[PDB]
Write a protein that binds this ligand. Sequence first.
Ligand SMILES: N#Cc1ccccc1C[C@@H](N)C(=O)N[C@H](Cc1ccc(Cl)cc1Cl)C(=O)N[C@H](CC(=O)NCCCCN1CCCC1)Cc1ccc(F)cc1
Ligand SMILES: N#Cc1ccccc1C[C@@H](N)C(=O)N[C@H](Cc1ccc(Cl)cc1Cl)C(=O)N[C@H](CC(=O)NCCCCN1CCCC1)Cc1ccc(F)cc1
Lengths: 298, 298
Amino acid sequence: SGFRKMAFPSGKVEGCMVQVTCGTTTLNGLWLDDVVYCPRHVICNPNYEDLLIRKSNHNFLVQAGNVQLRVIGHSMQNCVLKLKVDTANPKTPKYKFVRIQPGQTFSVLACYNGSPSGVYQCAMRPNFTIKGSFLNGSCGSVGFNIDYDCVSFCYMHHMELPTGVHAGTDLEGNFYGPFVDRQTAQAAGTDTTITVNVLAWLYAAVINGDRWFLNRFTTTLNDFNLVAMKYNYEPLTQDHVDILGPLSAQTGIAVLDMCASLKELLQNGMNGRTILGSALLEDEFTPFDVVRQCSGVT
Amino acid sequence: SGFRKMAFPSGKVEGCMVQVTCGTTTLNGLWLDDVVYCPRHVICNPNYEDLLIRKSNHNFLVQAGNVQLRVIGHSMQNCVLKLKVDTANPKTPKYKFVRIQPGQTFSVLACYNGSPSGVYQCAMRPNFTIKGSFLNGSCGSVGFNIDYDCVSFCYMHHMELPTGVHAGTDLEGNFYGPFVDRQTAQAAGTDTTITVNVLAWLYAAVINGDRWFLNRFTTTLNDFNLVAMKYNYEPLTQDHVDILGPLSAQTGIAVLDMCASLKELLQNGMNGRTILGSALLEDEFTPFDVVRQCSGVT
Ligand SMILES: N#Cc1ccccc1C[C@@H](N)C(=O)N[C@H](Cc1ccc(Cl)cc1Cl)C(=O)N[C@H](CC(=O)NCCCCN1CCCC1)Cc1ccc(F)cc1
Ligand SMILES: N#Cc1ccccc1C[C@@H](N)C(=O)N[C@H](Cc1ccc(Cl)cc1Cl)C(=O)N[C@H](CC(=O)NCCCCN1CCCC1)Cc1ccc(F)cc1
């Protein structure tokens, strides 16, 4: 029993974190085989191609623990700098680089000076920011998921926006969202609530033994989405209904039946009650996160 | 900016998790140097001394990854079984065993069949349970804190109570709370809210840039505790006031000034507002957790 925000065990990523210094700029890098990946703004409205052509391999100081790694080559891929080093990381896990969709979750290993400090779960918001916890020196920290000892890296942290939320790239250096890597005040689009995740979390609550929010009503998909629009929820698609199939089958509660519960919760509030220890509707658990953590029997 | 429930990086503990099997009972163990620690109920109203004297070293099957470890000795310390193995764990971190006080927090590495599955933060509740997330097979999972690469183990998981909360021991096998390791329905005492942690979390909110809940009033310690009793909060001691000193100094808000805010929040609710993304008052962040994660400048 129970339900917590749960991160993946971080050890496979801890062994890859290094420190990258250029001039007086120091941030984190990711050491996989004989390449270190880090935000290209370590070399700093900039012209990065002009700035990088003025660089030499010996301008980059890469430190793994108390060992200095020698840079033997460098290149830029979109917004990530790639530093070839003379030593392959002996702790490289099996890994992939993946670009995720909004609404998906991942674990963040927050790092400072190449040293891991903590791990927590994030969701990619519909507006392509994350609501992280990051201080100065955290840039280059990565987000990841793990499946059968393969690490799928999906996020590298690049900047905190003026609103205090966070923006970054995939590990091939492409930003999520419309952002660019320059120190200008940039604004994200208006955010929305991840409806399919809220529904997954309601199923988690039922699996854990809580039913107070259920009702005898059902709704059509179209009528539910009219309420969704009113409360700044993302539209629920038939694909979302399909992905909730397994949780619906396990609990015996049809998806559109759970939508009628969510509709009632949106229109009336919780009236002083909690769900899985929360007084608001939680949207940073995917259906996959629920299946991963909750019992396979209700 | 930001504030998340943040676990310690788990890699140093991941390298210590093993599987212990006796008969048809399998749970997790902790492999440090040449000793494996696990809940003694793996050998199962039992008489453990009588049950253990009937055991042989070869009755214990210890598996680290896909490698079997040979047990060369066994003993019982309170409610933990200690299995001497023929191989010292080459990944043993620097470590200590510590017994924590209620109100303190720790990271839990949830494990199944000796394989880590996820990491999350817990607090030891005033009634000596934890509100964990655990399924069948999780017993033997451990809780820990990390300071400068030393792992302080403080919890080993032994059982889920009928209410769905969790009970366990320190790593020397002494239960937290009044519980015993037998499969009987046991009840915890009534729980209370960890007042000093709620205050720490309000300071976290101020550091992060949120002030809406402050007021111009102060309170005496005695008058605050009269309100605390009314709302099932733990009494605030002068020691608690002292430990909040650093956060009070950083924010410029006297502790008894923040108590007046908490009093107003308890008596009036939040009136539709949130604090650090929560619609209820959070009590599983210690003052230390706040200093660790939040900026050192407001
Ligand atoms: N992570 C992180 C991090 C955090 C702090 C310092 C440094 C870092 C890492 C650090 N690497 C980092 O991100 N630095 C960026 C500056 C930067 C550097 C390289 C690039 Cl390529 C792009 C950017 Cl942009 C940074 O300094 N952002 C600040 C951070 C800030 O003040 N938050 C206050 C919000 C308060 C929110 N308020 C609270 C209540 C209401 C709102 C907001 C900002 C201001 C002006 C701008 F022009 C652009 C951005
Ligand atoms: N972790 C864990 C875990 C979880 C499940 C299975 C197995 C394990 C690990 C597993 N190792 C474990 O703990 N097993 C214990 C049984 C046990 C074994 C060795 C010892 Cl020495 C002591 C105990 Cl006691 C266990 O089966 N507890 C159940 C678990 C249970 O049904 N929760 C339902 C609560 C629903 C809560 N409701 C929801 C809404 C309202 C309340 C509650 C219980 C029932 C009767 C008793 F006599 C004592 C305890």
